[model samples]
Target: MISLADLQRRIETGELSPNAAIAQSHAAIEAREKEVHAFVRHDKSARAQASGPLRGIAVGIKDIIDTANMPTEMGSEIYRGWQPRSDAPVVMMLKRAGATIIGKTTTTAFASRDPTATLNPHNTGHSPGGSSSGSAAAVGAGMIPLALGTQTGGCVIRPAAYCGTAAIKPSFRMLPTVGVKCYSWALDTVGLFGARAEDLARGLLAMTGRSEFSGIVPAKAPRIGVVRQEFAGAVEPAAEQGLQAAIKAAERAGASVQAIDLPEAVHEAWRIHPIIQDFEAHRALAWEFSEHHDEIAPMLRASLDATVGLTPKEYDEARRIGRRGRRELGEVFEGVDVLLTYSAPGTAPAKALASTGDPRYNRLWTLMGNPCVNVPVLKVGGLPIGVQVIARFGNDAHALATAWFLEDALAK
Candidate 1:
């Protein structure tokens, strides 16, 4: 529960030296990373930097985004050892804000539904939920206070929920994404994770270069719209019980909690998820298919071929539907500042490493390109539970504020 400001004070005052900060995580990486497999490569070598801002804060960068000094392997053999010549804009933003880059976090192959080597540190048997496994797992395990993530398809919110950290996928393009994965260019958005929602707010404000918002306003009670039946059949007892407590906590804390369904069919919001993804995936990987199809992995080749096999007319028609669906969800935002619902279909799925858990709980927000935060609930017998709050597009400040409100209002 250390604040970003507190971390900065220690770092700035020499109570925490950058080398010591990086070294602190080495033991954590030593202890938990084996089962978690959070980072493909840990850049302890970059500890000797000529310092400026972020001289001491440790940050876990999701592997999907390239860290120039470190290898930018995108969880694929194709990008193995591919170091970029420059920092991604988000990375630059982090540096300017006085945060140090700790290491790369794990991710799903190609930032898709495929899971990563990272497991939930809380329970290694559970998935950390791709494509943001490493970043969320690192935060939950106390390795770092902050990390950067990308959520094209529930990457940030889901894993943050599973691993019990506060994370937000900002409105589309709110953070510069010049060097992250390009799954669906239209759908790709950078995300951030931190131990506290307020920490997240500070990091984001600093990253965007707005350094004056350090005001730690105690959250106002919110008018939370609770979806009692959202992805109902897919929840676990922990999620259900946690949500019940969350709603009651919200109510008791003076926030008006109302149970209401989204204006659109929840199922339909889901139906649009992979439609846009698959179609765009085809276009994105076209070059690999055309020139180096044999070099691609079986799963990837199959994904690319699915797009190649589609008729031009169908691809065009699908794109039409994708745009329509994205626009339609905006209508629902007019009435609510945020919607609180189950972040994942359930707790991290106890599946063998064959798949990432379901994105059904998240597709709607990704499609709408709205900002959403996964607000962690109780210990849940030492496991973490979360509720998601989604804000209208460009309402990221409100989104983070709302999430901050939830954590404070819903906590004892």
Candidate 2:
């Protein structure tokens, strides 16, 4: 697939019409969607909304996010034929900005541990990561230039790494989420996937009307903190090399880079993710579990059942820890513009595995509600592994801009 900027550039040059751009996306989907299993529904209903920054761009919406014109199955049999009455506010924003909604990508069942049929674009025999699996795979396979995904855990970041796509899990509530299926209200965040950081910057700027993401490389070198945490030691050597390569590249580019250890609280915060996520998820799907217990996937059923025994006291305590970490999260970045770490422990796992790859590297950040971008610049053997750039809460523009800066540095 062409980069988002290249596609728009062609349209602006009169080399490609809106319909032609949309058709290119559909053609790519038709060629690869069967192998990747990226979309549950690829609709051709989007005509040129015309007259906006995204005039000819093709966008894919994760199936869990409601789209009035198409079936919003939420990646579960329980919602197999469900159609929402209204579009998600974010979808409306995309449409109003002239983005062509090409299709609805697949998602994990209830955005949980249960895996999707979507396969890694780099290697079909490996897992593509989960929750936002289809969104990542679709973009990675060149089926779409941009895709919308929801993240409660590592859904966006990890999947982007596995599939070698550029993605950003913006700060919690940073983008509109009014009609997205709820998994964990506090942790769930809307994110975007693109082939490159500039592509992400362009899409985000149009959708949020944020001029800060000007699509320009930062004027000043960003202060980058190389983070070392207990869990980070468990990372495979290849993934670690990817992190080191990113650090070295940034340093060579004249960016200030230094090693920093995380606060103990950040490590402790990791333990409470399940407490908060599972507690909220249990209530989020209360009705469905009550009505369609047998039809739900066994892994998700067991997970929801486990949450039932969690007391309110435990949930509240987890929230308190989360709050404390949110407060301390800034201190880790006190001397740096952003923190860099491995996007995952390794590359996409083999397909025969029962579980998607671990999200330990991502859980604390999700709990802190900070912005994270998976910068897909590293490769191990023949497959890709990515590094993440994290920013203080609400500094999404800077996070993406810094990522844009590094992405260019690495490419050169």
Candidate 3:
């Protein structure tokens, strides 16, 4: 494993320059990109970055966000050659933290349902689930230590799970979304991907400029609330095995665990997400879908066209219903600090490139906008699986604590 500890040693000893690290990542792209297709655009001048703890660590960014020095194509030909004059605040935040931009990673078109060509690093024939496919794949492939992604219906979580890496999606608004492409304004969330859970916590601290958050929480046994999602449909047997394995691993670590049937109200989150996404997304992309519908990727254009047709009453009711769901789901915290579930229905779907895998395992949390971590653990039936550990809406630090503790327990 290309570990952060190794990089930190180089940084502390002054043996590795930022340029050297950036060059290594660049060469990896040149070597493996043919099969991966993970990067959107590599910044030719990124080697010039020369200062910070990450002063030279090459950070891959999902293509939907503005990176200033490179094109922000959002993975659609419609915005090809598009360049934002200023970097998104998040990119600026990373650059300011001493990280160098290696490249913008591929993203599903418009950061939505249509996935890009990126494949899992472990096996070329398998997929890196979307819409954050490239971000997850790049890190899993060891091309970069960290990358940023967003979640609106499991875009970040499912990919992290499928690719066999670690990830943390911050509470909906805890991280700035100034430059993210909108999927669901109400649902879009900032997230980070790491090769390991400890790395993810540190990267988040670095990226957010609050580096003090990396201290490992004492491994107090977790009190887990295992939730089986029903409305999204039955969980695949393999996914259940993955969930069960995680629970056992946690139990072995002395975590007190129990099953909890999600309230019936939890079922409504599925339908409500699309309703709100469609309603607000219609307004989010108002001028473009209106003027350039023909220019968007076919699948993305279809979603936009469909959203424009949602009725006002349906839009309002969806938001109203979503609010109620969050209020009720809040009761879940009465006993547990974290709730666990399948990150997706099953392994990465062995389907056509025309679509990404089902994100049913993720949408409800997106609806609640809770902080969630996708922890890579089980390898069921020859596929990497991830489990989602969710926490109270604003308890991001607590959620990370759960993830850190569980990840360390599994390591033992």
Candidate 4:
């Protein structure tokens, strides 16, 4: 995987030219895209600017995000051949930072439960998770230094974990969502995929021009609170081993580690995540579900069919639970700087399976609208397993820094 930070440093030092760096990514995509299927389509002619922080970086935008230069089909037959008139705000932000938008990555239909044709970069026979499937696979396959994806449930983190790339589902609104296809207004979050935590930092810093995302140093012996989400159900043994490995690495690196149970409200919020998601999705995709109902993917179609009767009253109650969960989650942070949990139940499932891995562990944190980073820690039978580092709402800098720390420790 190309490191965005490394690429920027080389470009700045005159070791590599910006256009040359982009050419390298184009070559990589041409070499790997056939088997990986990480892209819906790519622009070999995309050129990088010779200026700005992300000048040399090549980025893949998920198909669900609008890109005027390329089709944004949203991975649905309903919108085949569709194109938007302008880039999503997030894409515009990347362009303004000097990153070249090289292509559209595949996404599950409507960024929902449906799977994409994308296969894991590490093992072609395995699924690349969902929604943000191609974004994660593209970065993981070393086709690009950075990519943009979104998470309404576990779209960003879970796919990143499956593909062995670093990713962050930032504090809910940290990245603008305007022009990105909406799934759930309250739950949808724009996120980034990169080679590692520092790469994620570089991408975020370049796009946002935020000082906090700049000059990130791994937190020195940071306090780590581990949360095995009991309500999320049992994780595979590989996931358990991955978390244990991370804990030991952190401990050996002089960080304080302890287990902590979340407050009950957060657990309840996890339970109601689907309620809020389905209720909002019904409206967000109302046209497609109402007009092109048969064309919608089976999994999401079944979901919509099953939840059509969800009431306004239920949604209101779920919102109240979500608010309480966020408040109590804030309290959880008072005891520690970050919480550690499984990025997914385990490694990517076999590609032959119709289902993408579960998002149970990820939903609560997404519901709370906190910053969560997936740091690839270990691999099982050639498949990667990652553990997430989650910080309190709005503390994205700390979250990225700690993730960097963990990634560094695990590597050592």
Candidate 5:
């Protein structure tokens, strides 16, 4: 896979021109896009500026985010050929950082439960996970060094895990969501996919101009807190093996690791995540669900249909529980710098399954609004699996640092 850090280093050293680096990405897309189906559309003509922190980077924007020069069909037939007059703030941020907007990657319809035709780069017969399917696959396949995605549940991290890429669902609202399709106002968060945690850090730093995201490796090992997430139900053996591998690797790298249980309130928050999500989604997609009913993807349409009767009282109660979860989760960080858990139930399921793997392990963290990073740590049957490193809300720097540490440890 192309490394954003390596590309920038070469560009700064005059070893590779900005356009030359972009051409490398175009060459990669030309080689792989046909089978991977990672892009909805691409522009080989896209160009990067001669200067800026990310001068030579090529990025894929998930189709749900508006880009004035391209259509944001959102993987939904209802909004086919929809074109917004402006780029989403996140896309504009990438442009300002000197990255080329190479194209729009596929998304699950409305970034919800439906699946896209995108195939996992690691094993084409397997699903790439969704709703951020194409972004993960494109990066995983080395078609682009960086890409933007979003997660209301496990859309970003889970897909990254399935596709064998490093990714992060940043702390809620860390990146502006304006001009991006909304699923749940409170739960939706913009995220990114990259070849490694350092790549994600570089992308975040360049886009946000936040010095804390400098992609530095921490000098000291982080105190790791492992959470099995028993409340989320049983995971496949591969998932458990991946988690254990991470723990062993961290220990070998001189990090102190210990098992920890989340507070009861946080577990309850996981239970009601769907209520909060569905309640808001019903309103978020009001027009599409009401007027273009039949055109909506069957999976998402079925979800909306099943939850159509959700009441305001249920939503309010769920929000209250979520508040308590956030408070309790904040306290968890006091004892440990970060928490480690499975990134998904297992590797990507086969395409024949016709389902995106469950988000059971991810919804709570989204509800708590914490920063979470997926570290690709293990592979079973030639398919990758990952373990997530999570930090307290607003502690994005710590999350990335720990994730980088874990990724390096596992590599060794």
Candidate 6:
């Protein structure tokens, strides 16, 4: 797999040319795109399009994100062949930063539900998580060094973890979401994917023009918090043990590890997420639901149908709870630098087309607007498990750095 940093360093040192750097990704895609189905439409002959911090990088934009030059179908027959008029802000940022727009990756229909044809490279039979399935699979398969993804729930982290790639679900709006399809305004977070956490941080820095999220190299052993109280029922034993193993490794590396109980508001936020997500989704997709009812995916249709009766009252209450939860979550971070939690219940589900693993472990952090980075850790029977490092809201750089610290420690 290509490392974004190494490739950039090589290009800067005149050891590698930008066009050739992109060509490498094209070669990988040519070799594996067929089985992986990572890209709905990738320019097999794309050349370097811009020059900046991401000058030679090949990036896969999730199909839900607008790409003016390409069709963004959102993995649905309803919007098949729909081409946007302008690139999404995130896409614009990538191009402006000199990144090549290599292709559009597969996403769940409307970024909602029903799995895609994208297969996990680690195991073709297993689902590559959703709805950013192709983005994760493409990076995991080494077709590209960077990609863009969205997380209304666990679309980014879940897929990245399932496919054994590193990802950052930055604090909401850390990366622009304009021109991208919306699910839940409060929950739809733009994220980045790469071969490692440091790569993701670099990509984010380029996209957002932010100084804080430059690179993740912790100066000292971090203070790690283990969260087991909030969503214990959703996390399976494999995931629990995987997290503990990471904690053990971190402790051995001179990190301070401790357990923290989530506040009731934090737990309540999980329940409130579905309400906020569905209610907003119902409105955000009002036209599609009305005009393309039969064409939309079944799971998406049922999801809308289930929330048809939710009043603004319920949504408001959920938002209030979300605000309170965000306010209360500060307490959890007082004694810790980041939380080491399950990225998913366990490894990717065994190639199930009907379902894309669980997202319960991911919902709370997403709702709280905390920055979360998935650090690939243990592997069971060849499938990967990841531990997520979460920091307080807007602390994207610190979270990325700490995740890289743990990732480095685990790698050793």
| Top model number, lDDT | 4
lDDT of each: 0.76, 0.86, 0.80, 0.93, 0.93, 0.87
Q: What's the candidate order when arranged by decreasing lDDT? A: 4, 5, 6, 2, 3, 1
Q: Backbone clashes per model, in order?
A: 3, 0, 1, 0, 0, 2
lDDT of 6 by residue, 1-412 (tens): 6689878888888798899999999999989999999999998767785469888899999999999999999899988889999999899998999999999999999898788988988989898998899999999999999999899888889998889899999998777789889988889998888998789878887887888976457536888888874644857777877888899888887899888788898888888889999999988998999998888899999888878999999889999999998888898788888888889988888765477887888888888989999988888878888889898888888988888788778866
Measured by C-alpha RMSD in angstroms, how accurate is candidate 1?
2.8
In model 5, the Cα lDDT at residue 285 comes to 97
Q: Cα RMSD to native, each candidate?
A: 2.8, 1.4, 2.0, 0.7, 0.8, 1.2
What is candidate 4's local distance difference test score? 0.93
lDDT of 1 by residue, 181-237 (tens): 788877788998888777887787778755433564545777677764454355778
lDDT of 3 by residue, 100-189 (tens): 778899898888777688888777777888999998888888778788988888899999998888888888887889988886788888
Where model 2 places Cα greater than 4 Å from the true spot, the runs are none
Error of 3 at 69 (Å): 1.0
lDDT-wise, the better of 4 and 5 is 4
Residue 338 lDDT (model 5): 93
Q: What TM-score should be assigned to candidate 3?
A: 0.94
Collision pairs in model 5: none
Tell me the tens digit of each residue's lDDT in model 4 across 110-160.
998898999999999999998899999999999999999999889999999
Whole-model alpha-carbon lDDT for candidate 6: 0.87
Candidate 5 TM-score, true structure as reference: 0.99
Q: Model 1 off-target regions past 4 Å?
A: 1-5, 12-19, 48-53, 211-216, 228-234, 265-269, 311-331, 351-353, 379-382
User: In angstroms, how far off is 249's CA in candidate 5?
Assistant: 0.5
Ranking by TM-score: 4, 5, 6, 2, 3, 1
Steric clash pairs (candidate 4): none
